[PDB]
RNA sequence: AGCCAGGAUGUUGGCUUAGAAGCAGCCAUCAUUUAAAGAAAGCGUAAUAGCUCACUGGUCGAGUCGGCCUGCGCGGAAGAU
């Protein structure tokens, strides 16, 4: 490994990910196959594409060296084997869908989803998300309410 | 920068300078400028491991020999003829 | 097994124990590096 | 595709598909059925190009007939009737002889996008360098 | 093929078996049959002709001495 | 140090070979995707296949690694009343 020089950068850009971020979720890789990484990446891919990570860490002593800065709700998250995902742009999107669509392909478990920070709490999958830019469910809100 | 903690020779000739040598000490002397030599004697483990470094032969170094700093250049070395280890040394006064 | 005087380790999984007096070599992968006598 | 079982690639040839010294039988014959690579592979040929490389998997368990897979070129190989030299040394790599093209490389290696890591099409553009240093031959940037 | 002083050429993978193409010198091949039984199970046929002259290796040579 | 995981894509790098697909040889040893993963440290193969290592993620929970100099010891060490 690297000395202190190198553990220091794996937080001060981890953490201006949080700091500068959107949304965040949850997931325990025991199995994780490396189709598993190729796959996620297309996602972040599609989730725009090196805007995303993963970077295992869930040593406390690392994303939570990020945390008592924002999202001291992971203090309970980081223990045991984690894969901490982070959103820069993008709604505070589908992220959230897929890792539970993904690891219900068996995918490896999905720390039960521990969940995380948007609000401040916990677990429960929502497609509560890429509606966004479903606001077109507030322009069929027009003429059907000016009609019926 | 080199600190060389050093004590004036009491003892000189053959028969000392191998006592010392027994005892991980090793002799060398101070020469130079218009004043008179100094017989030195130094602690062997230590000019081993800081003559180690390059800069030990190109910077000018600093000898406390009972409280005075002498600041010298190391001049020549007398290494054993087949062991790791240091026999004497020249210092030129700088 | 092999005897020799000088004995140490051949493959990356090759031991070396000393059992008794006696200076051994065990290997879990290749029986042709036994070794006694070390 | 998210679980393997069984994969041989020899690459093939599209013009007619019916060897025998290269391949021939020994592309079917484990429960695989050398009457229909004349029947399917030829209808997943036509729409694109003949003669040139072809891996392959194939879909057989031991169910007597399958279904037919594509695949992609090799890619230091897209360097030869893609590039110029159909060899890669004549002088041992202890000289440094081939020749390159750098307009080619990103395009020529994009005809391979759809089997490749890097995000960022320029990536896997950086992926082809060492694909075409492979000798030594140096590119004319 | 390759021990008994052998040259190969090619294997085809001719549908079953795998034809396995080989120059091979004669004072090399006798009772091949036998042995080439032993290595395959019995299950091995195999054929051969005049092909050639080429350079004796030494030892051969002056083995060969009348 | 154990134990769980992964240990990948260009790609069998190129050359050379009947075959050299990480691994007989020669030259190169980059670039991706990354948490990390050598154009490979060893097993293996006709060659592929197959099993490991380096490396990183997890678990664990305080010491731990290997060179230099030196003292005393061990093997090496079989003979005839």
Redesign the pocket.
């Known amino acids: ?1 690297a000395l202190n020089l190198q553990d220091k950068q794996a937080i001060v850009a981890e953490v201006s990910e949080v700091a500068k971020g959107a949304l965040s979720a949850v997931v325990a ?6 189709v598993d ?2 796959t996620e ?1 297309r996602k ?1 891919g599609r989730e725009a594409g ?1 805007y995303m ?7 406390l002593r ?1 994303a939570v060296e990020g945390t008592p800065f924002e999202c001291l709700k992971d203090a309970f998250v980081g ?4 894969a901490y995902s982070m959103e820069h742009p993008g709604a505070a999107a589908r992220l959230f869908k897929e890792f539970a669509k993904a690891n219900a392909k068996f995918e490896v478990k999905a720390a039960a989803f521990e969940g995380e920070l948007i609000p401040a709490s916990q677990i429960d999958r929502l497609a509560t998300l890429p509606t966004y830019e479903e606001a077109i469910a507030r322009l069929m809100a027009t003429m059907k309410e000016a009609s019926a | 920068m080199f600190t060389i903690n050093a004590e004036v020779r009491k003892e000189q000739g053959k028969g000392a300078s191998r006592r010392l040598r027994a005892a991980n000490k090793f002799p060398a002397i101070i020469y130079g400028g218009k004043e008179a030599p100094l017989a030195i004697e130094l602690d062997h483990d230590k000019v081993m491991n800081m003559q180690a470094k390059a800069e030990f032969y190109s910077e000018v170094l600093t000898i406390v020999v009972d409280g005075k700093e002498i600041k010298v250049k190391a001049q020549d070395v007398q290494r054993h003829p087949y ?2 280890k240091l026999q004497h040394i020249d210092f030129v006064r700088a | 097994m092999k005897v020799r ?2 004995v140490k380790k051949l ?2 999984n090759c031991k070396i124990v000393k059992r008794d ?3 051994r070599v065990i290997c879990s ?1 290749e029986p042709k590096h036994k070794q006694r ?2 | 595709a998210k679980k393997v079982q069984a994969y ?4 093939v040839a599209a013009g007619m598909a019916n060897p025998s010294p290269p391949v021939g039988p020994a592309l079917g014959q484990q429960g695989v059925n050398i009457m229909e690579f004349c029947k399917a592979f030829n209808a997943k040929t036509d729409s694109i190009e003949k003669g040139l490389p072809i891996p392959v998997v194939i879909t057989v368990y031991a169910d007597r007939s399958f279904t037919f897979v594509t695949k ?1 070129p ?4 897209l360097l030869k009737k893609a590039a110029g030299i159909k ?3 004549g002088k ?3 000289d440094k002889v081939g020749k390159i093209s750098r307009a080619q490389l990103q395009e020529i290696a994009q005809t ?1 996008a759809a ?6 099409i320029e ?2 553009t ?6 075409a ?4 031959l140096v590119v004319e940037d | 093929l ?1 021990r008994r002083r052998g ?5 085809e993978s001719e549908v079953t078996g795998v034809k396995i193409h080989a120059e091979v010198p004669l004072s090399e091949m006798f009772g091949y049959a036998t042995q080439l039984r032993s290595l395959t199970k019995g299950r091995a046929s195999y054929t051969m002709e005049f092909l050639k002259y080429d350079e004796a290796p030494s030892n051969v040579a002056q083995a060969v001495i009348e």
Do not use: F, W
């Open positions: 490994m890789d025991s199995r994780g196959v490396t990484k190729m990446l972040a090196v990570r993963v970077v295992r860490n869930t040593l690392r223990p045991t084997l984690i | 062991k790791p | 005087a000088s493959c990356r007096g006696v200076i992968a006598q070390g | 041989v690639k020899l690459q992609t090799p890619a230091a190989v060899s890669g040394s041992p790599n202890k391979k089997d490749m890591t890097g995000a960022d990536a896997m950086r992926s082809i360098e060492g694909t240093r492979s000798m030594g | 390759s040259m190969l050429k090619g294997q």
